[PDB]
RNA sequence: AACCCAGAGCUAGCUGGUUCUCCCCGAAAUGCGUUGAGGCGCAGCAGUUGACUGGACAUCUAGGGGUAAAGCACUGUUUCG
């Protein structure tokens, strides 16, 4: 058959491959993982709430 | 305000750490607000993608100010006769 188990493959442009973070820095996105220096936004845990405005009266308010 | 076990991998806007390669582009430490000030949101500045534009650099001209300088005509201050 032409077509076969060992001739096929995917499109082009179909399947990346993944950032694969925390793997070094020439791969791109570093030892930080691309979050800048210590902060709140690079914690493990749920951040801030979509909306919140650091205490200012968001806008679903006023 | 005992010890052990469990809820419990409690929570930690705080420390520390986050592993292979090459190529291209490439910041910001400013403003507003905040039970906020070593945090966050938006704007500003990056990257990437798309659309619409033709400007940028240089030269000349025009337009309104009230700084430097200058001055004592006003407001104050001041020397001598
Ligand atoms: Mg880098
Ligand atoms: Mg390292
Ligand atoms: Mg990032
Ligand atoms: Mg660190
Ligand atoms: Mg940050
Ligand atoms: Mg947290
Ligand atoms: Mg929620
Ligand atoms: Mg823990
Ligand atoms: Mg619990
Ligand atoms: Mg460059
Ligand atoms: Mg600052
Ligand atoms: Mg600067
Ligand atoms: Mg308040
Ligand atoms: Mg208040
Ligand atoms: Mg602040
Ligand atoms: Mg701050
Ligand atoms: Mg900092
Ligand atoms: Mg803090
Ligand atoms: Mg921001
Ligand atoms: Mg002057």
Redesign the pocket.
Known sequence: TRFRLDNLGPQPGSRKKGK?K???????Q????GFGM??????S??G?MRG?????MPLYRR
């Open positions: 694969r925390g793997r070094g820095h020439a791969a791109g570093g030892g930080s993982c210590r902060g709140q936004k690079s914690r845990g749920p801030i919140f405005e650091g205490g200012q």
